[PDB]
Design a protein around this ligand. Sequence first.
Ligand SMILES: Nc1nc2c(ncn2[C@@H]2O[C@H](COP(=O)(O)OP(=O)(O)OP(=O)(O)O)[C@@H](O)[C@H]2O)c(=O)[nH]1
Ligand SMILES: Nc1nc2c(ncn2[C@@H]2O[C@H](COP(=O)(O)OP(=O)(O)O)[C@@H](O)[C@H]2O)c(=O)[nH]1
Ligand SMILES: [Mg+2]
Lengths: 199, 237, 434, 430, 200, 56, 58
Amino acid sequence: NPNVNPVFKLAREVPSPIINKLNADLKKQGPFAFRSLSKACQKADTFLNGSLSHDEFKWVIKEIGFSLTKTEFDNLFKFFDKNYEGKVIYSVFIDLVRGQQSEIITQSLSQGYDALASNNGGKVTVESIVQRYNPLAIQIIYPTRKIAQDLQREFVAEWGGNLQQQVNKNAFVEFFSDVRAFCDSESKFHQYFSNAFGL
Amino acid sequence: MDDINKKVTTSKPSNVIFNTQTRGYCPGYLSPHNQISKKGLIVLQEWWGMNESICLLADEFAHQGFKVLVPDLYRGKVAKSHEEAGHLLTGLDWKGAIEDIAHALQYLIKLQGCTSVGITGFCMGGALTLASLSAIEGFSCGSPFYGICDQQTFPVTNIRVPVLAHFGEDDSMVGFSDVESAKALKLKAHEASVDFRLRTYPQAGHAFMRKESKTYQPQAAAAAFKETVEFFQQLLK
Amino acid sequence: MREVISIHVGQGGIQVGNACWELFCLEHGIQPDGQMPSDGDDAFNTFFSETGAGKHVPRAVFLDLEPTVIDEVRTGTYRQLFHPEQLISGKEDAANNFARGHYTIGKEIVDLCLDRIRKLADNCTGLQGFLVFNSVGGGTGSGLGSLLLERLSVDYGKKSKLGFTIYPSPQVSTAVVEPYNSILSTHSLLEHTDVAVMLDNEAIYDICRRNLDIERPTYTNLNRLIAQVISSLTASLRFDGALNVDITEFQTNLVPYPRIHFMLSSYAPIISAEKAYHEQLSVAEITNSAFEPANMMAKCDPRHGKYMACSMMYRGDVVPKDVNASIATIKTKRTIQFVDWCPTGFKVGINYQPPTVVPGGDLAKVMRAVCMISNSTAIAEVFSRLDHKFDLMYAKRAFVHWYVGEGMEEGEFSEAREDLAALEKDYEEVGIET
Amino acid sequence: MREIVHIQGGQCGNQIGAKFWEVISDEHGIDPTGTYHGDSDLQLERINVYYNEATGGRYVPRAILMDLEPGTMDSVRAGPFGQLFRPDNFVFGQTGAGNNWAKGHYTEGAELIDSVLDVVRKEAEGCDCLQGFQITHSLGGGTGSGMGTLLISKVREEYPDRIMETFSVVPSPKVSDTVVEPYNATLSVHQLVENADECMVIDNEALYDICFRTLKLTTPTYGDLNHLVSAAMSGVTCCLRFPGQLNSDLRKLAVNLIPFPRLHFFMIGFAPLTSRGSQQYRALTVPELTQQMFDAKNMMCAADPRHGRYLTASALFRGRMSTKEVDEQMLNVQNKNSSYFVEWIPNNIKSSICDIPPKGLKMAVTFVGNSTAIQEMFKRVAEQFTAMFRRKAFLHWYTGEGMDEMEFTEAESNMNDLVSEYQQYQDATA
Amino acid sequence: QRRANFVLKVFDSIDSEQKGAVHPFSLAERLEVVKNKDYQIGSKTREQLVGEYVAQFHKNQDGLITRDEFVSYYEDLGLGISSDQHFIEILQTQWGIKEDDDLAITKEEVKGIVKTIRQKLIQKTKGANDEFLLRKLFKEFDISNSGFLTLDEMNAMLIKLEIPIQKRYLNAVFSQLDRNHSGVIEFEEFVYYIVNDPYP
Amino acid sequence: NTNNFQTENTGTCTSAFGPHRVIPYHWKGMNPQQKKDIILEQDQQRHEREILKNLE
Amino acid sequence: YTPDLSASARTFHKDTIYEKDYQKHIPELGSKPTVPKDKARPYNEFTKTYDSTHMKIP
Ligand SMILES: Nc1nc2c(ncn2[C@@H]2O[C@H](COP(=O)(O)OP(=O)(O)OP(=O)(O)O)[C@@H](O)[C@H]2O)c(=O)[nH]1
Ligand SMILES: Nc1nc2c(ncn2[C@@H]2O[C@H](COP(=O)(O)OP(=O)(O)O)[C@@H](O)[C@H]2O)c(=O)[nH]1
Ligand SMILES: [Mg+2]
C-alpha cells in the first residue's frame, strides 16, 4: 500500500535511553571522563584481543561509577552482542556512546598531528605535547577554579607516567575526540584546539 | 516516475557480431530490411544504450535505401532509469569505443559487400560521430545530431568529409549541445576550411528525434529526416 | 461547430450591437482592425468567419432606415472589421410609425436584407439559430422587425429564433406613441418568435445606480450590461465545461406551452471593484442575490406570481457540489414558489471560462458569475400596463389618422387588442392549481 | 474465450466509459500507448476478454462509443488513455437530441442506428464465443436514454441467448438539473424491463453521499464519482479474468439473483472505502469488509434497503483469504438480520473468491443485491411524472415526432405493475 | 517616411563606424551571408567574385558609397513597387533585418480615448460638479503653485480617476493637446479642452 | 505510411521537361508561395486605385 | 504645543502612485486583447462535416 508504511523491524535497533543516560552522566565527571572509559577498557583488557566478556564489561562500567541494573545491562548487551558470541567489541561501544565526529573537526585534528610533528622532524613524542600547550585554555571549554599550576599535573596525570611512550596518529586523533565529547559545541572545541597548539 | 514507455529502456536482441582483435568479438544489430543496397550506414546509440526506439528508428533509415548496422558500445548493458544512465555514460571509454566503429566499418565493407559507408549518431552517438570522423579513415560523410565531442582530444580540423549537423535553440544543456556552441563549432570548421553544414530547427528541444516522448516534435523530425536521407542519397555512391 | 447569426434593426439594436461585438472581439482576442496578433482549436467559428488571409468578418447584419446611426459605425474605429455591403442603411426613417416601417418604406429594404442573410447563411452548415435585437418602442425597429420575422418564418422554418426586445418602460419613456407600435409588434412576434426576452430600461437603470454606484449612467452603460448577458448565454457553445447546453436545449426546458414563450432575465454579480475586492463573492451568495426581484432586469415583481421554469448558467471556477447545495436553499426559501405541475424546474450549465472585463467599463474582474432566464406568470403585469396605455389612447382615436393615411387598415388595432387580451387570459389559466 | 463487448452512449456514458477503461488498463498493465508493462504472466493469460489483438504487439479495446453530438467524442479523445480507442468505432450524429426522448428514439435514433448496429455486429462476429454485452448510459439524458434503449431492443432481437447488463444512472429528485427528466426516465424504464437481463441502478445523490462522508474530501468532482463506478464495474467481472478458489461469471450471478424474470434490478456497493488520513488506522480484515458491505449508506442507490427485504444477495471477494472467513461471516450476517431477509428462500446469499487483489489493496469486495426496497425510487419518479402529465406540460415536443399519448398511458401502467409486483413478493409468507 | 525610416536603419546596421560611407566589401558580403548558409567565411577571389552583388550603385572619388546615393537607389527602385508591405518585406528578406514600429496612434482612436475619459467624469456626482473635482486634485499636488502641469502628473492624475491610460496612448493625447512642444500643459487649458469643447 | 499516394505528395506533380509546366491530371492546387503573390497584388491595387482618385 | 504639521493631516490624495490597493488590478485601458489559453470546446472530429464532400449522400 503506497499510502501506509508497514514500519515493523528487520534489524535490532539501538537501545537509546540507556546510552543517552550514560552520555549525560559522563559529562558530569569532567573533560577527560571519556578518556577514562576508553582507558578502563584498555587497562581491563590486559591481553589486547579487542573484546570483553560478560563479567569484565560489568567491572568496567562499575569502575567508572555507574551502578546500572540488570535490565539495563541486558538491553545494552543485547544489541552489541547480536548473536551471543559471549564477547562484546568495546571499540564499537565507545564509538556509539561518544557520538558522531564532524568531518571538519577530524580533519583539523589530522593537521594538528602533522604540525606538531613538523618541529620534531616527523616523529611524535609525548614531551612535545606536554611542552607546547595552553593550560589556561581549560576555562573556555568549561569554567574551573583549579589554578593553572595544578592544571599541568592534571593533564600529565591523565597521561602516562613515563615520558617515552610512542604515539600513533590514530591514537592521537582518538585522544582529542574523547575530549570533544565533553563539550556540546563543535565550534567551541575548535577554538580551544587552536589556542592549545597555536594553530 | 520517469516517462519511459519500455521502448527506450528494453534491450533489443542482437544478431551479428564482429571481431575487433584488441577487444575480441562484440555483438551488434543488423537491420533485416533492405539488404540489396550497397550503400551502408552506421547508427550510434544514445546514452541509454540499444533499445527498441533506436532500433525502430534505424529500421526507418534502412527503408530508404541503406544498409544499417548498430554496434554495441555498452556490450549488453541497457540503462533502466535516469539515475544509472549517467553512470554508464561515465564508465564508457572513448579510446575503447573508437576502434569498434572502425572494425564495424571493416565488417560492413568486406563481409556484407558495401561500397561506401556513412555514419549517423544521436546525442552521445552524435558526439561519437564527430569523434569517429576525425580519427577514422574510410568514411564518406557523417550526420551528428545535437552532439559535440571533446575538442582537444579530437580536433575538428582533421575532418576530411562533409558534415551535416542538426541542433535546436531550445537546448538546456550547457557546454554539450548549445546552439551557440554549435555556431562556434561551425565557425571553427569554416576557418579550418572543412565542409560543414549546420541546420537549426525552430521550437525544437533536446532529443527531438526520439519518438513517443515528451520531447518529440513531429514537424521538425520529418524535415530533418528528409534532409539527412537526401544528403546521404546524394553523397554516397 | 455551432454558428449563430445576429440581426440588428433600429437605433436601439445597433447601439447594443456595438457593445456586444466590442466584447466579442476582445473576448476572442480579435483586434479592432480584424487581424489576430501573432501568438480544441480556434473556437471562434461561432461568431467570426475566416477569409483565408487573416481577416475575420462578423456573422451579423445591421439594418436601419436612418442613415445617421450607420455613419459613425463606418466612421468609427471598427471601420475595417465590418463587411462594407452588409451594413444595410436606408434613405428615410419611419419616424415612430409602425405603418411606415411595415407597409410603405420597409418593403424596399427587406429584399436586399434577405439576399444578404441568404448569402451569409450558405457559408455555415451547422447553424443553430438567429438572434434579433430591436427597440419595440420605435418606428422602423418595430416595423422592420415585425416584417423580417414574417419572412424568415417561411423562408427557413424550423430554425430557432431568439429575440432580445426592448419594451417601453412603465412610467417614463421617450416618445408619446409607444403603446401603438408596441402592441402591434407584440401580435407580430407572438406566433413567429420562439423565445422573447425582457430588456426594459427602468430595471436596468436601477441596477446600475444601486450596485455600480453611478449617479449619471447613460445608454453606453446599459448596452455593456446587455452584452454580458448575451455572452454568458452563448458561452456554452464555444467554451468547455462540466455541463454543456446549446440553443435547442433552452426551449425544451423553458416553454411548457408554445403560446407562452416570454422570459425575464437577471444577472449577478453586478458590482464594481470598490465593493468587490472587499467581498468574497461565493457561489451561494451570487445565487441568492440573483433571485432578488429588485435585481431583475424587467420592471416586474416575481413575488406576485408563480415560477414556470428556471434556467441558470454559471461561468468561472464553480463546482457542481456547491451549485446543488445552493439550489436546495432556494427551494427551502418560502418567498419563491413554483407552479403545482412543476416538481423540478431548474436547468444548470457550467462553463470554465470566467467573464472577461472590458477596459473602460464599470464591472470588476470576478471569478464567478450567473445569468438567469426565468419564466413566470408575473410577466402578465407588464402586458396589462400596455393595455392600460392603449385604451386611454384609443378611446378617442388619437394619433390614429397618422396610421390610416399610410394605407394600413383600421381594423388592425382591434385584432391586435383581442390577441393581447387572449394572451393575458392564457397566462392566468396556466397558474391555477388542479 | 467468453469475451464481452462494451457499448457506451450519451455524455454520462462516455465519461463512465472513459474512466472505466483507465482502471482496466492499469489492472492489466497497459500503457496509454497500448503496450504491455506488467510484471506477472497472469495479467496476459486472459487479456482477450477486453482487448483485441493488433499488429506490433499492441491491444485495442472492443468498445463502441456512440453519441448524437460529436463534441463528446472530441473530449474523450483528448483525455488520458485516449489513443487506445480505434477511430472506426466512433459513430456520431451531427444534430443532437436536446434532452428529448422522442427525438433520440424516433427521428435521429432510427436514422443513425444502422451504422452503429453494423459496427457492433462486426465486433460480435470477430470473437470465437461471445459471452454477453454490457451497457453504460444515463436514463435522464436525451441520447443516452432515447437511442440507448432502442439499441438494446435491436441487439436483443438478433442475439437472444446472450446476456445483457446495464449500468444505468437514473436522476434523483434531490439533485435535479433537468425539468423534463421524469418523462424520458419512465419511458426508458418500461423499455428496459422488457429486454435487459440485468439492470444496476446508480444515483448521483448516493455517489455524492459517499464522497462527502466516507472519503471526507471537501470538493469532489465528476472524476471522483466516475472512479467509484469504475471500481465497482470491474469488480463484478473479476473472477472471469483471474483464477480463484471459486469461479463465477456473469451468467452464474444472473441465475442466483433473479428468481423471476421481471425482477432484475439490483444495487451495488464497493468496500473498503477509507479517507486519506485514516488508512494507517484501520485493520483490513474480512469481518471489517462484511460489516461495511451491508451498511445501508454504502449503497449507490437512493433506495434504503432496510425498508424492504433482500430477496437475494451476492458477494465477490477479491484477494487472498481462507474460505472460513467468507463462509462463516455470510452465515453470521444472515442469522443476526433474519428480519431483513425474506423467509421462503433459505440461504439466499452467494459467495465467490478471487485471489488477485487490486493494486494498492490486499482485499476488496464487490456486492450485488436484489431487494424489494428498490421499488421506492420508482414510486418517487412516477410521482413526479403524474404531477406533470395531468396538465400536459412540456408535451408538444414529445407529440411532435409522431408519438401519441397512449404510449404515455402505457408507460404508467407497466411501471405501476412492476412496482406492485415488488410489493406482492415482499409481503408473502409460506 | 516609413520606407526612409527602414532604409536608414538598414544602412546604419552596416555603418558601424558612422563615417556616413560604407566600403563596398561589407555590403557585398552581407548580401551573400543571408542568401547562402554554406558560402564559407572566405573565398579565393572573393573581392571581384562578390563585387557583382554590388556596383549597381555608384562610388565617389574615394571609392566609398555615400549614404545619399544608397537611399537614392532604393528611391529609384521604390517606383516599380506600389505596396508598402511588399517593399518592407522585400528589403527585410534581402537584408536579414526585421525591426519596425508596430503602429502609430491614429486620430480615430485618439477621439475614442478622449470620448471615454470625457464621459467618465459625467457619471461622477452631479452636472455642475466634477470641475472642482478636477481642480482639487491639482491643488492637492501642485506644490510649486505655478499652474504648470507635467506628463508624469498626467499619468498620476488619470490613475486617481480610474482611467489607466496606456503610456503610448497617453503620449499621443498629451502631444495632440499642446502646441507649445515644451512638454508642459497648462491646467486651465486642459480643463477647457476636456469640458468646454463643442466638438469631440 | 511512407510513399506518395498515402501522403498526398506535392513533389510528384511536375513535368519531365519543364519546371514550370504541370501534370494536367495530378494537381493538388496552388502552393502558399503562389497564393501569397495574389494577396500582394490585391494589396497593390488598393494603392493603385487611390492614385487615380487623386488625379480626378 | 503646535499641531504636528499641516502637511501630515488626513488628505484624500497623496503622492504614492497607487493610493489604494483598489487601483492596482484595474485592467489597463489601451492594452491589447489577449487570446484565451488552452480552455475551449474540443474541436477534432467536427472537421469532417465542413469539408466540401459531405454531400453526394448516395
Ligand atoms: N436599452 C436601450 N434602448 C434604446 C437605446 N436607444 C434607443 N432605445 C430605445 O429606442 C426607443 C426609440 O427608438 P430609437 O431606438 O431611438 O429609434 P428606432 O427604434 O429605430 O425608431 P425610429 O426613431 O423611428 O427610427 C426608445 O424608447 C428607447 O427605449 C439604447 O441605447 N439602449
Ligand atoms: N455519475 C456521473 N454522472 C454524470 C457524468 N456526467 C454527467 N452526469 C449526469 O448526467 C446528467 C446529464 O445527462 P446528459 O449528459 O444530458 O445525458 P445524455 O443526453 O445521454 O448525454 C447530469 O445531471 C449529470 O449529473 C459523470 O461523469 N458521472
Ligand atoms: Mg430610430
